[PDB]
Design an enzyme around this catalytic site. Structure first.
Site, PDB file in Angstrom:
ATOM      1  N   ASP A   1      -0.775  -6.204  -3.719  1.00  0.00           N
ATOM      2  CA  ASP A   1      -0.455  -5.282  -2.625  1.00  0.00           C
ATOM      3  C   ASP A   1       0.764  -5.680  -1.797  1.00  0.00           C
ATOM      4  O   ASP A   1       0.837  -6.777  -1.227  1.00  0.00           O
ATOM      5  CB  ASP A   1      -1.674  -5.130  -1.705  1.00  0.00           C
ATOM      6  CG  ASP A   1      -1.521  -3.972  -0.740  1.00  0.00           C
ATOM      7  OD1 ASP A   1      -1.615  -2.809  -1.189  1.00  0.00           O
ATOM      8  OD2 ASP A   1      -1.283  -4.221   0.454  1.00  0.00           O
TER       9      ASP A   1
ATOM     10  N   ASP B   1       5.161   1.042  -0.153  1.00  0.00           N
ATOM     11  CA  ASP B   1       3.718   0.727  -0.070  1.00  0.00           C
ATOM     12  C   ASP B   1       2.967   0.959  -1.383  1.00  0.00           C
ATOM     13  O   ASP B   1       2.757   2.087  -1.776  1.00  0.00           O
ATOM     14  CB  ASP B   1       3.077   1.573   1.042  1.00  0.00           C
ATOM     15  CG  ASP B   1       1.577   1.331   1.167  1.00  0.00           C
ATOM     16  OD1 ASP B   1       1.121   0.215   0.849  1.00  0.00           O
ATOM     17  OD2 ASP B   1       0.856   2.264   1.587  1.00  0.00           O
TER      18      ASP B   1
END
Lengths: 375, 375
Positions: free
Chosen positions: B261, B81
């Site tokens: 992201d 992440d």
């Protein structure tokens, strides 16, 4: 005994249902309902800021085409307005393109025309018309009287409704002169001239035919109702509205303002109030169609209640529901819609008046109610 | 040369579409689209305050790969992440229902465990986990280091995504945020301990196997890209965010913030900006489903442009749309979503990474892009 005139009603949902069939949107309506029944999306939809009911969605236009003005019996199509006193027709001198398709008033052709000429303008919700006062003999059924009306010479600001509607003028069944003048509405003037027994009119809207109604002027025909006739005092000097405690199931608004109007096609309620009721009743809005829908066998739907100081009125589901027979007979549309006029104003429109015969009494400054007799 | 770790890719739209199919909503999707592209009501439809896109549920992309902890190398699946700087695994001391199917970390079985015990709560999207700090040897591919991480003892507030997904814990590839915690993220710590050449990592998503991607730590693998690799300095200290001028057809946002992201399944854009583009492109939101759809044969859809001071990146329609083959192969869904994350802020998620090899460089405080090599 008293003069009764029949009228026709343009029901707003008729064109909507027509469009749905024409554009093959039946499956869309059915799947939309099914989707909230699939439990996927949790909430149940009741519209949005952009996807909401507008006043035009609940306009129940009442058309009357037998009225005439002047010695040579000039014909007009009128719609009724219970919210104002004014009567107007378009002039032969109106140059608006909206007037080019209408029946026009020609003063020069009537021997009973009496000139006034005072310039005047009046504004409705759908726009403004301008012209001047004129007087002539107006006939409505077997009633005739000299009456001061507005001759409209400019209807440019009544667009796009005027050119797109089938009426010529408007006949007021309310109180308020929208102009600088203070001209009594035609029913009051009929009484002043001793042409009717009392300054009152009644509405009988047969439950079996939603496209018609009857306006009686000057007195009450007891054949139209059964049981008690009960009166409620107006809470305002200028509009047919009364105080009522209104119950939609467990939701109650005390001392609400209830407007009584056959020109409104549904019951209307403040959005925040009605949405609480609809959520509990598993009623949903079809996205971007003016249709609130549920199952016909919905047995949570209550009899609505309306309480005054002395009386209690009720409206059973059979009056505020109708099956979507050409889409799915198991699905019903509701005749209760959200309209925000202010914090506590409801409109008792067509569905209420299909159950209740109604009396509008200028002398008593009251509305009378009785259960209609179905003939 | 540098450490490369494979990972599985979980894309959230696959779950959405499976649910549509299971609940027999294919017809709903098709008829909804047919209604709104018909333009009957308006040139709708793009949602509302009562039909909104929820960032965290709708667009939660998961890259998850293997890592180990302890001298007995206990295995875990970690989300990789880029938006967070924590590393956590569920503890044997976790009694959450959600933990009962996970690989659990057993400190007592590792000779290299060092206790800390400071208790913390950290958030991810709409969810949070609670636990306490521990230190042990973490293994990632052929890398090994002592590292301070969180043992989670309560994962109740990470429902329902936790019990519904295959990952055990999360490995942070973001920036240290001292308002959360003081531990350097693992890639920074690896370079601190002289275990990798540089404090950088990269993502490569090869088109020939769409369910697998590759995380490379410590340097750049030339095999994964073609053409020039150009860097963009971050314009934030905490996020992989850069300054771009963004063109969606004729709509241009100057001085946009764009965050790259690994946890976002779409391109995201400010609602007011994106809605202008979608309206023009005949892209419609299916009411109450997180789907923005158009016809596959739509020739108006442009190549998106992303301009920096020195460079220009582009994203062709092939990367930001896909046919809804299991619902209606004539319709395509768009991987661009309207979310208001902050002023002028866009997220470059999966569709951008599927075209561009991406480099995240802690030392240069930059991201780098090159066209990914795909035969």
């Amino acid at each position: 005994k008293h003069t009764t005139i029949g009228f026709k009603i343009d029901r707003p949902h008729d064109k909507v249902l027509s469009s749905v069939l024409k554009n093959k949107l039946s499956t869309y309506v059915k799947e939309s309902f099914k989707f909230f029944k699939s439990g996927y999306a949790q909430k149940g939809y009741l519209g949005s800021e952009n996807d909401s009911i507008e006043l035009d969605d609940v306009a129940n236009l009442m058309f009357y085409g037998e009225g005439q003005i002047g010695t040579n019996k000039q014909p007009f199509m009128f719609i009724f307005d219970t919210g104002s006193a004014n009567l107007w027709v378009p002039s032969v001198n109106c140059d608006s393109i909206g007037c080019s398709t209408k029946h026009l008033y020609d003063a020069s052709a009537s021997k009973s025309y009496e000139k006034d000429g005072t310039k005047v303008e009046i504004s409705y919700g759908s726009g403004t018309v301008r012209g001047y006062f004129s007087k002539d003999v107006i006939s409505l059924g077997d009633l005739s009287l000299p009456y001061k009306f507005i001759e409209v010479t400019d209807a440019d600001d009544l667009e796009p409704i005027y050119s797109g509607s089938e009426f010529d003028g408007i006949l007021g069944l309310g109180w308020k002169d929208l102009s600088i003048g203070s001209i009594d509405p035609v029913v009051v003037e009929l009484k002043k001239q001793n042409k009717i027994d009392n300054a009152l009119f009644t509405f009988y809207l047969p439950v079996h035919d939603k496209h018609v109604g009857y306006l009686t002027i000057g007195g009450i025909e007891s054949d139209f109702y059964e049981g008690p006739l009960t009166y409620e005092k107006l809470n305002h000097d200028l509009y047919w509205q009364i105080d009522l405690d209104i119950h939609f199931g467990k939701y109650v608004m005390q001392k609400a303002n209830a407007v009584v109007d056959s020109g409104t096609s549904t019951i209307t309620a403040p959005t925040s109030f009605l949405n609480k009721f609809f959520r509990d009743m598993n009623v949903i809005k079809v996205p971007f169609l003016p249709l609130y829908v549920t199952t016909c066998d919905n047995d949570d739907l209550p009899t609505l209640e309306f309480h005054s100081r002395n009386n209690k009125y009720t409206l059973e589901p059979e009056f505020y529901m109708d099956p979507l027979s050409d889409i799915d007979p198991a699905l019903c549309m509701l005749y209760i819609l959200p309209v925000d006029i202010d914090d506590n104003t409801f409109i008792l429109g067509d569905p209420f008046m299909r159950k209740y015969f109604t009396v509008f009494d200028y002398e008593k400054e009251s509305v009378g109610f009785a259960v209609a007799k179905n003939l």
